[PDB]
Design a binder for this molecule. Sequence first.
Ligand SMILES: [K+]
Ligand SMILES: [K+]
Ligand SMILES: [K+]
Ligand SMILES: [K+]
Ligand SMILES: [K+]
Ligand SMILES: [K+]
Ligand SMILES: [K+]
Ligand SMILES: [K+]
Ligand SMILES: [K+]
Ligand SMILES: [K+]
Ligand SMILES: [Mg+2]
Ligand SMILES: [Mg+2]
Ligand SMILES: [Mg+2]
Ligand SMILES: [Mg+2]
Ligand SMILES: [Mg+2]
Ligand SMILES: [Mg+2]
Ligand SMILES: [Mg+2]
Ligand SMILES: [Mg+2]
Ligand SMILES: [Mg+2]
Lengths: 131, 274, 63, 85, 96
Amino acid sequence: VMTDPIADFLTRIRNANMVKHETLEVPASKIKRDIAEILKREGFIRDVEYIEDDKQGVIRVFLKYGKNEERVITNLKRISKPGLRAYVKADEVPKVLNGLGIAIISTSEGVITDKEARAKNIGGEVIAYVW
Amino acid sequence: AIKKYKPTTNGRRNMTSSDFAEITTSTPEKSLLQPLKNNAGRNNNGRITVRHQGGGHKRQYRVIDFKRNKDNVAAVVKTIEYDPNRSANIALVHYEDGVKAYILAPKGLEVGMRLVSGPEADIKVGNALPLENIPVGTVIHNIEMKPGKGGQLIRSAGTSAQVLGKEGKYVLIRLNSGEVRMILATCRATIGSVGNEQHELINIGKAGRSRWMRKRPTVRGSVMNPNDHPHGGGEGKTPIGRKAPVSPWGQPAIGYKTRNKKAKSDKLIVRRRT
Amino acid sequence: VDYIAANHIEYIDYKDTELLKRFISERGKILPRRVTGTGAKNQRKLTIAIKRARIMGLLPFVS
Amino acid sequence: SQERKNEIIKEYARHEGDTGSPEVQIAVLTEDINQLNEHARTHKKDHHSYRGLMKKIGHRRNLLAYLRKTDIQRYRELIQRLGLR
Amino acid sequence: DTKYEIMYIIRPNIDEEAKTALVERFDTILKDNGAEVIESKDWEKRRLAYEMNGFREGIYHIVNVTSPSTAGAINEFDRLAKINDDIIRHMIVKVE
RNA sequence: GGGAGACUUGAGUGCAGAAGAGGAGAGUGGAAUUCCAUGUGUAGCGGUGAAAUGCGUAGAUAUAUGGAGGAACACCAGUGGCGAAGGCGGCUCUCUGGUCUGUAACUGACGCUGAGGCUCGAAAGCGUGGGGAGCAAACAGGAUUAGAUACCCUGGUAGUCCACGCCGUAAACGAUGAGUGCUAAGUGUUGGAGGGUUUCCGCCCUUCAGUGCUGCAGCAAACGCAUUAAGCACUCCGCCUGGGGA
Ligand SMILES: [K+]
Ligand SMILES: [K+]
Ligand SMILES: [K+]
Ligand SMILES: [K+]
Ligand SMILES: [K+]
Ligand SMILES: [K+]
Ligand SMILES: [K+]
Ligand SMILES: [K+]
Ligand SMILES: [K+]
Ligand SMILES: [K+]
Ligand SMILES: [Mg+2]
Ligand SMILES: [Mg+2]
Ligand SMILES: [Mg+2]
Ligand SMILES: [Mg+2]
Ligand SMILES: [Mg+2]
Ligand SMILES: [Mg+2]
Ligand SMILES: [Mg+2]
Ligand SMILES: [Mg+2]
Ligand SMILES: [Mg+2]
């Protein structure tokens, strides 16, 4: 059974990106929408749209590829896992490739990138790394 | 089934007996009881003719109906009873005309079965038919050797014979011993096998129990004196020290056949065994 | 051609010895379904019917 | 037997037309379990069938655990009706 | 109930009247033991593909019956048919 | 994470269907082997690399008709089916488990994994009682050999079979734990489902669950795996830390 829909979402993106698939689809959840929009506004993914269905909804991700079909997303990594949760204090927020990547972090203020988290000086659960 | 006693005492150790689960009552039929005295292996001359017999518990004889020649009416099995005289259990049966009788209890017999005897009886456990009417391959017991004499063969607990075929006025039978022989087709037999199959597996356990069952001690000939037994005598333990072991009266005791060589029944015995 | 399907019969009686005879070779041996062109399901049903016929003497075991 | 199954379903239905529900499933499983226990005692050496019986027992246990967690009163009522522990 | 079909082989020698009596006996057996004989017929009289009990010929008889599976009718028929000499061989098969 | 609700996708039920050597019990059929009986019949038969032991004039082998009994189920039969695994192949009946496909009526997360436990578990082996044809450890004899406690030959007991009860191990292997999702294709085959044809048969398209083969991406020390991953991920469990001693 699926024990980590978030990790499943990241791996779906990773697999689709590896094959350079133009788009992908996932069952919709609030955390997944947050991750998708963060990637959108960070320019990793081309676009995001939402389909309303009767089960839980669907989120469709249009991947972004650069000139020469170069992959924008080098890789994604799930940091906090159900097996072992990962929490970082405000001063512990990490840097992904010295900022060239990002870390998606869930805080009391919402799901935000590591830049924003250390701007507000708040910690949280390190959901993922992206670069 | 067989119940094993816990080794509470050296005598009780390794002892086993029957649970008598099949036995439905312990009150035999007064009309069918007869008195029996313990001959203790002594004949009219008063001499011990068969050694190692005598003593033990008192018994009453139960008149068994080995003939099964009452074909008019059906017999309802009322009870399954212990019989001190034979290894197998007996069954008290009531004929619809009111005649009470005892029969051997075949394996699988149950209270309420309505047995029948005669040529037209169906082939069911406990029924009695002349051998000519019993289809080949059937398992039977309580076989009689002469018509109207009553069953003589296959009566011990758990025994059974099988019908192999017909020929002339005779019926081919395999007896419990494995011997195949012809038996007159007008002789009767009971369908099934004798119940109480477990009897063989009882472990008597102690000497006193054999004494209850009327077996007196058996003394080995090798520990008698020369005037008592051909094996008697000799200093210390001795080997047989003869051409072959012999009974107290010199009859060889291993492999020496004793069946009469001019037996009239050789003409009917097809294949021997034992 | 799956003869059973072509005739469109879903029941294979073991008394249809005429039907069964076209699936057994000389010597009474059963024919492979690759040789006979039939499908697996009808092949199994034919096998059962032929064996039942053999037992009841409608067909020969050998020769 | 479908007829026996349907009568049990109607008996324990939480409401009209309720084929699936903790009570109905548990009751149907209990009857199958009892019937299959008799088959097992008749065929001690039917190990393969016994495996299916164990799976039914486990599924019935899981349904009971869920029901007790969800509505303890319904759990008590069901065990009393079915004579369970 | 479960539909059974019983095809059994009567020995060729038997007379017509004895054969009829045999058929009635076995039909009576089924009905008494709780089965319902929907049909019984003298299917054919055929040479056997191979000798059976010393017979190269036989009279096949078909009885279509329907009984509860628990009922002992089929078992009792099989037992009595096995015993009876008139019947060479009987086959009982479920029919859907 | 807790508490009060809601939901139907996972899970299960209902309803309608499909296949099957799945299991257990009781019966039952034919070929063949061996033995037994009886004819015919005469000097060999059998066996090896070559021989011999052995069986045979007390009539063998062969051959014909029968009889007995035991074990296994030819053809079908197929990287075919079924089972969690071990494994399951004549046929019939009785009892009985699971699986698959539709459908969307029902419940509404009820699920996954699972230490310890429990159950099952080839073959051999063990206990009690049966059975015993063929095969065959041990064993006998004939060979081969320098020797041959072997390979080969002729015989042959336990065992192989049955019932019950122990045992609890196998290169028990895909030498690959279970669950879930995602990531090119091509081509067989088993069991289904829907449609477009096709008079039907049948052909084509779609689809589910198996089962093979080939082969991208990716992985790998390499060999290779590759939608039945050894790829990409998450959960739980078992297990490894130089070789020998062991
Ligand atoms: K003792
Ligand atoms: K007695
Ligand atoms: K003595
Ligand atoms: K002495
Ligand atoms: K017969
Ligand atoms: K089934
Ligand atoms: K043994
Ligand atoms: K294996
Ligand atoms: K396929
Ligand atoms: K060391
Ligand atoms: Mg004595
Ligand atoms: Mg002395
Ligand atoms: Mg003397
Ligand atoms: Mg002496
Ligand atoms: Mg001395
Ligand atoms: Mg074994
Ligand atoms: Mg040898
Ligand atoms: Mg091991
Ligand atoms: Mg596939």
